[PDB]
Amino acid sequence: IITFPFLFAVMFGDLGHGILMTLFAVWMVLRESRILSQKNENEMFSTIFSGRYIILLMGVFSIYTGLIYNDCFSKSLNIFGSSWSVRPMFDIYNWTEETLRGNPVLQLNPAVTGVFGGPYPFGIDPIWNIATNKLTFLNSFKMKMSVILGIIHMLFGVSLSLFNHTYFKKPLNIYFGFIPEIIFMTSLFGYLVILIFYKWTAYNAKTSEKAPSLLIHFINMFLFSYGDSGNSMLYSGQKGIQCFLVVVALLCVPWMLLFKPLVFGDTMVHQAIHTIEYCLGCISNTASYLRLWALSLAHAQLSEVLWTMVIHIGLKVKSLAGGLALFFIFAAFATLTVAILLIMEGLSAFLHALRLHWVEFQNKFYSGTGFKFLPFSFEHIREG
């Protein structure tokens, strides 16, 4: 009820479309009395009306994540901030009026004193939206946060598989189905989310232009080749702790395989499939959470092209801009942002926040053979 509109809001996050998604939904719940009076309509109002409370929670959550990164119709807002200040750049760096020619795109410096102070109380500061290196900051942020949300939602899914054993009273299943599963995930991937948190607090802009990469040191955990002067280590004793964290995960594969079937030919071969669909599946499930970064980037890029190409030609006109020009520009813009940026992007983010629950969350605890109740009642016969 919470995490499915929340995973919809990380990949469809916009304050402007967060207003339109719930105002379409508040209209469908405050006027729902007269809609149940009608018999039936088309399935663009039958399937949509059957989920009128799902879309309401997708609106109020995407107002929030459409405020963390600012992005309101690709426009951004100021609420007591913009901590990046350009005026100390002209003073202490001896950086005069040369701006005109020479270099027309000039980059600030965080290590010189006065430019950056405070990481903008609530969310992403709006200096990035008027910058042109905006994407090389967000792709370092939106990708690494797609794994942070991809591990603690999948570690939460394996914590719900403990109560699937201690309630049914199967304590044999704990010592090969929950304990080696949580060691295999915390040593490899739970160390990755504290390696992302380490690089955010350790390295600053002054020291370490030679900063390490988290792509290389994660691969160099599996491939045991340690020692190279290209990538410096993140901290002291990294060769000590990371060789320990990989060998505790290597013994989890015999811990899941060799110690369950001692109760035989079909519990060794067919239940090895239960290990190898978790062994190479858990890596391919973590990387499958990169689709809430790709959809967050493709939605943020589509919001620019309807502003800087459709709205901007209706705005950047000298004398008669808001007159007869902008009346037909916005009426074609309102059709283009509903049919494209709200219908298909609202449906592409709908499925890939749904398939992340069916495959990457309901495979750790949810088996689901099932048989529905369907009680005998006369609620089929309401009015027709």
Binding site: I130, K316, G322
Partner: protein, 65 residues
């Protein structure tokens, strides 16, 4: 029937969205500096004069529908 029904919800959005565009251009906001070909503030209000006369023009489409 539906072309008369789709026009009011577009006009009701057309008055809400374009009024706030008028106030965000009246305050001379720093995020909107791409649409400008003390002197620069007067160009900003001019676009706010532009937006408002189209925000009021959607009220006429509401009464026609």
């Amino acid at each position: 029937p539906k072309l008369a029904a789709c026009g009011i919800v577009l006009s009701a959005w057309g008055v809400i969205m374009l009024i706030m565009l008028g106030i965000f251009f009246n305050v001379h906001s720093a995020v909107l500096i791409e649409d400008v070909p003390q002197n620069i503030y007067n160009l900003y209000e001019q676009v706010s004069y532009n937006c408002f006369i189209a925000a009021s023009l959607y009220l006429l489409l509401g009464g026609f529908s």
